[PDB]
Amino acid sequence: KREHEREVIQKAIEENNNFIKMAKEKLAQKMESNKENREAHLAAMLERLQEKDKHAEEVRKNKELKE
Amino acid sequence: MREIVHIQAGQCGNQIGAKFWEVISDEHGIDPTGSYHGDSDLQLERINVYYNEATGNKYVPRAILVDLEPGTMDSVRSGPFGQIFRPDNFVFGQSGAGNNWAKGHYTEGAELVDSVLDVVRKESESCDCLQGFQLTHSLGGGTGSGMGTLLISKIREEYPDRIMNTFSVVPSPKVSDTVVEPYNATLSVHQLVENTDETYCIDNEALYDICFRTLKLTTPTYGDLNHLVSATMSGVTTCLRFPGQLNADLRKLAVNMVPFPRLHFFMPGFAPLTSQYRALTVPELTQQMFDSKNMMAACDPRHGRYLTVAAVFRGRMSMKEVDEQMLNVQNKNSSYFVEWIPNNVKTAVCDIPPRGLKMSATFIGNSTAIQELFKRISEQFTAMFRRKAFLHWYTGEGMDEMEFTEAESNMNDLVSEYQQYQDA
Ligand SMILES: Nc1nc2c(ncn2[C@@H]2O[C@H](COP(=O)(O)OP(=O)(O)O)[C@@H](O)[C@H]2O)c(=O)[nH]1
Numbered sequence: 001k002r003e004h005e006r007e008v009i010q011k012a013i014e015e016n017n018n019f020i021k022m023a024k025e026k027l028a029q030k031m032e033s034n035k036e037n038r039e040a041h042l043a044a045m046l047e048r049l050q051e052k053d054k055h056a057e058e059v060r061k062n063k064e065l066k067e
Numbered sequence: 068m069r070e071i072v073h074i075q076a077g078q079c080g081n082q083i084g085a086k087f088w089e090v091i092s093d094e095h096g097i098d099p100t101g102s103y104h105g106d107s108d109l110q111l112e113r114i115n116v117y118y119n120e121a122t123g124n125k126y127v128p129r130a131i132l133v134d135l136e137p138g139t140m141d142s143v144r145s146g147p148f149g150q151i152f153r154p155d156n157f158v159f160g161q162s163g164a165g166n167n168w169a170k171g172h173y174t175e176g177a178e179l180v181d182s183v184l185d186v187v188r189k190e191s192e193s194c195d196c197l198q199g200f201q202l203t204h205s206l207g208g209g210t211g212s213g214m215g216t217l218l219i220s221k222i223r224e225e226y227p228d229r230i231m232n233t234f235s236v237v238p239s240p241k242v243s244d245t246v247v248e249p250y251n252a253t254l255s256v257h258q259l260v261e262n263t264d265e266t267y268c269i270d271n272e273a274l275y276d277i278c279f280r281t282l283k284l285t286t287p288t289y290g291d292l293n294h295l296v297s298a299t300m301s302g303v304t305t306c307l308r309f310p311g312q313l314n315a316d317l318r319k320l321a322v323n324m325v326p327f328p329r330l331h332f333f334m335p336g337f338a339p340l341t342s343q344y345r346a347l348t349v350p351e352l353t354q355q356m357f358d359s360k361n362m363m364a365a366c367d368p369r370h371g372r373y374l375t376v377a378a379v380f381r382g383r384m385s386m387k388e389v390d391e392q393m394l395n396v397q398n399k400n401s402s403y404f405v406e407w408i409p410n411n412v413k414t415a416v417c418d419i420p421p422r423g424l425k426m427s428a429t430f431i432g433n434s435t436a437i438q439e440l441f442k443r444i445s446e447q448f449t450a451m452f453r454r455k456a457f458l459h460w461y462t463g464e465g466m467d468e469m470e471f472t473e474a475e476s477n478m479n480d481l482v483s484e485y486q487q488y489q490d491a
């Protein structure tokens with residue numbers, strides 16, 4: 001009975017720790033997946049805008065080199 | 068064998084336990100501060116069974132007060148007789164047990180139990196010849212139920228040869244704190260079957276009905292139920308607290324009442340039921356104590372058979388008439404007492420009546436009809452357990468479903484065992 005009494009409290013601690021653990025890890029997982037996603041969205045937006053600057057360079061070099 | 072050590076656990080344990088010390092302190096002429104202002108020498112002759120003598124001829128209850136929260140135990144110290152208890156024996160936690168057996172037995176209570184056992188050992192050591200322990204508790208909450216049964220298990224380990232008594236308050240929907248009571252009770256019954264020699268089954272169902280039907284209390288409080296409990300506790304301890312031929316002790320009671328070791332659940336009864344002016348004749352006491360209406364456990368004794376009986380008459384009365392009347396109910400209802408324990412009814416008389424009444428009778432019965440109580444709790448248990456309802460409260464403190472299954476099985480076995488002797 002005493003050894004069983006220690007197994008039960010050890011289990012209660014184990015599972016409480018497990019919840020705290022997997023919540024901690026699940027959270028860090030999401031925050032890191034999110035930051036990579038948000039940054040990937042903004043990186044693509046800026047890379048489409050920098051692709052316009054580089055098309056404006058072609059149109060400004062078609063007036064200067066067609067005269 | 069004289070000294071008993073009393074422990075009261077949880078709300079109920081300490082509420083009824085306070086009333087017990089109020090009732091018997093008046094009977095032994097002890098006042099709210101601890102001094103003896105009596106009149107009869109018979110009051111002090113075995114005061115040693117429940118009280119220690121102190122510096123200045125104060126008498127101090129050999130009582131340990133246990134709870135996981137300080138609510139109830141601050142009330143006990145506030146209340147009428149609180150200042151009599153030894154202040155070191157107040158052992159309490161802070162967070163309580165949330166009507167959860169598991170918290171009492173396995174987590175919260177485990178933290179506190181070793182301190183209670185240090186006070187138990189303190190009281191146990193300064194005892195000439197300890198006979199045993201009595202615990203007051205309910206089976207329905209978490210502290211008195213789970214922690215209480217944890218204590219019992221520990222006390223048995225350290226003192227395996229001493230007697231263990233419980234006054235165990237069984238729960239009812241009619242007086243109900245929470246839906247998990249049947250769970251808590253079934254987990255505690257499993258403990259009591261293994262680790263006690265005697266248990267007085269005080270059913271709250273039966274106390275509610277006595278209060279409602281027979282005493283005309285429309286809206287009964289816990290005070291009204293505990294009035295009935297402390298008069299029963301007074302009665303079933305009379306033979307230990309007074310003289311004088313019956314060398315009655317807890318072991319003798321255990322030997323004569325309990326033919327099979329698991330079948331030690333006693334149905335108590337009291338007459339007359341109160342909250343009078345006309346004293347009762349011995350025939351009336353004898354009719355009343357044996358009446359179903361006067362039982363402290365909600366079981367019809369006609370549905371079962373009496374294995375053993377112990378009856379205790381209080382007041383000045385003819386012992387000739389007491390034998391005649393006690394022999395009359397046996398001879399006139401002989402089918403209801405088992406033929407295979409000859410002379411299973413034993414009767415005693417004590418000259419001191421209780422406060423209020425000129426004469427009274429207390430009944431102690433090991434009837435097989437007690438099964439009805441365990442059947443009632445087994446049914447409420449299954450209603451919920453078949454859908455595993457409310458279990459998360461228990462599994463969150465590390466308990467497993469297998470432990471509930473085990474416990475359900477032990478109780479149903481108990482019921483089978485009582486049913487075995489009803490038909491023999
Ligand atoms: N007869 C009686 N029953 C009580 C009393 N207090 C609580 N109960 C019952 O005891 C059960 C709840 O247990 P309680 O002692 O409050 O829980 P604990 O403090 O956690 O042990 C329920 O069945 C209540 O109806 C009381 O003073 N008298």
Ligand SMILES: COc1ccc(CNc2c(-c3ccccc3O)nc3ccc(F)cn23)cc1
Nearest residue numbers: 303306315316319320323376377411413414415
């Ligand atoms: C078959 O039933 C019994 C036989 C022996 C005993 C031992 N002592 C005892 C008791 C008794 C013992 C301990 C605590 C409270 C008690 O009230 N009450 C009686 C009444 C009559 C009598 F003969 C003995 N009694 C108990 C029951």
Ligand SMILES: [Ca+2]
Nearest residue numbers: 162174175178
């Ligand atoms: Ca704690």
Ligand SMILES: [Mg+2]
Nearest residue numbers: 078166208244
């Ligand atoms: Mg309560």
